[PDB]
Design a protein around this ligand. Structure first.
Ligand code: PRO
Ligand SMILES: [Cl-]
Ligand SMILES: [K+]
Ligand SMILES: [K+]
Lengths: 259, 254
């Protein structure tokens, strides 16, 4: 129990009522109403979309900002409602893309401006490392799936160039991984394979056991896989640096007559 | 006055308190900053643990109770004006975060936590999962301190750490900390002559007949070659793994 007066809950540049502030509400009573749902989230300010599935015991609600949705999720997840324990989660984004091979001088804003040609962009991010250096990867989140499908189609058919550098970007669907809730023990199916696997507890393979032989063979195979992958990485880097040099030398031949 | 919420739940189930996940960095502090003044700024975000203010540097650290409370404090206090300075409120960089790969099957967040607790005190352990709840085979292990993570990093490379009955050890590596939240704002880009040379041409599609069309087509071909190369490596690795397992099964006697 703690009361907080929220003065700043919208992040700089954050658009409101996006799919990033959309919550999934599951294990609802079969008789749930739109008004019941709205009352449940009343405390978390303004509400946008409220959708309840006609028969399936789940719905969606859009809150104003990520902060408000994060607070509502923590407070309302596992909340008892008429014999049911509610499941409140962030809704899976229907229109999120991974952008690879980003050139230099691409800002979040430029990424948004670039992809805004395909439809309404909710968010665009140029991913940076622990020293603020761009990784070469980015995220583009559209408001709807048709706009994301347009971007995917157009960027595979054509060569989408964000800057002067003649290297097109790669646009793929976002691989959505949950690194927050993960795999709780309760949700693991306790079948025959489960019990077979849990016979032995976490340990280090001890010399003189059947498993030590096999685990050492597995370690050797993993080291072989590392060597194989390192060679492919080196070949690709070399091939890319060759092409990137030709691209840089041919670009520095554009403004020759422009200026 | 803003939006007032009587918070009744700010701790996630199983969440440990005052961890590095709830630890915040506070830069651009005014020179006349005190521990009491710092505590009063964060007073509204509940109980505070560790409060550290650097000897002279004008930065500090504050541990809040939970990740939710730290997320609220960060959003509220970041880029706030205080004594002519605009505060920089960020999550403290995690000093003891690991990526576990080659996770066997039937590993849960709790099993991963029991397993890594042998090297030291575990803040959080997560089995990463996709959009259907199937495990990715990657996980996260966050320790309270750096020595526990270095211990796990060394031990798992020297030896074969097996989580289940399957005799395949897990791969432990430092966590690659990437920011997919703040990213690269236009404000942080130095608008020099190279900047303008790069932004001379706007986002567009390379048109046939242009020199850019020829280079983009060469790049597309190179990417397709890389995909073919990677697909072959993936196939070889899978085949090799399946082969090793079949040899082990043939060897096996109940
Ligand atoms: O992922 C694998 O290859 C095996 C299956 C059971 C335990 N781990
Ligand atoms: Cl930082
Ligand atoms: K711009
Ligand atoms: K367990």
């Amino acid at each position: 129990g703690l009361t907080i007066d929220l003065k700043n809950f919208r992040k700089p540049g954050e658009k409101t009522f996006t799919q990033r502030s959309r919550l999934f509400v599951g294990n609802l009573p079969p008789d749930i109403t739109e008004e019941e749902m709205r009352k449940l989230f009343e405390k978390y300010g303004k509400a946008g979309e409220v959708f309840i599935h006609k028969d399936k015991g789940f719905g969606f609600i859009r809150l104003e900002t990520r902060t408000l949705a994060e607070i509502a999720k923590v407070e309302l997840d596992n909340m008892p409602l008429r014999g049911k324990q509610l499941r409140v989660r962030f809704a899976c984004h229907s229109a999120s893309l991974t952008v690879r091979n980003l050139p230099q001088y691409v800002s979040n804003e430029l990424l948004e401006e670039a992809f805004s040609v395909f439809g309404q962009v909710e968010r665009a991010v140029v991913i940076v490392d622990d020293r603020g250096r761009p990784s070469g990867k980015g995220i583009v989140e559209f408001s709807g799936k048709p706009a994301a499908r347009k971007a995917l189609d157009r960027c595979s058919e054509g060569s989408f160039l964000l800057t002067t550098f003649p290297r097109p970007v790669t646009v793929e669907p976002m691989d959505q991984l949950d690194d927050e809730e993960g795999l709780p023990e309760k949700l693991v199916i306790k079948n025959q394979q489960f019990h077979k696997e849990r016979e032995q507890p976490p340990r280090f393979a001890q010399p003189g056991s059947f498993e030590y032989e096999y685990a050492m063979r597995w370690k050797a195979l993993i080291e072989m896989e590392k060597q194989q992958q390192d060679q492919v990485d080196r070949n690709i880097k070399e091939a890319r640096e060759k092409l990137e040099m030709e691209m840089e030398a041919a670009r520095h031949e554009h403004q020759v007559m422009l200026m």
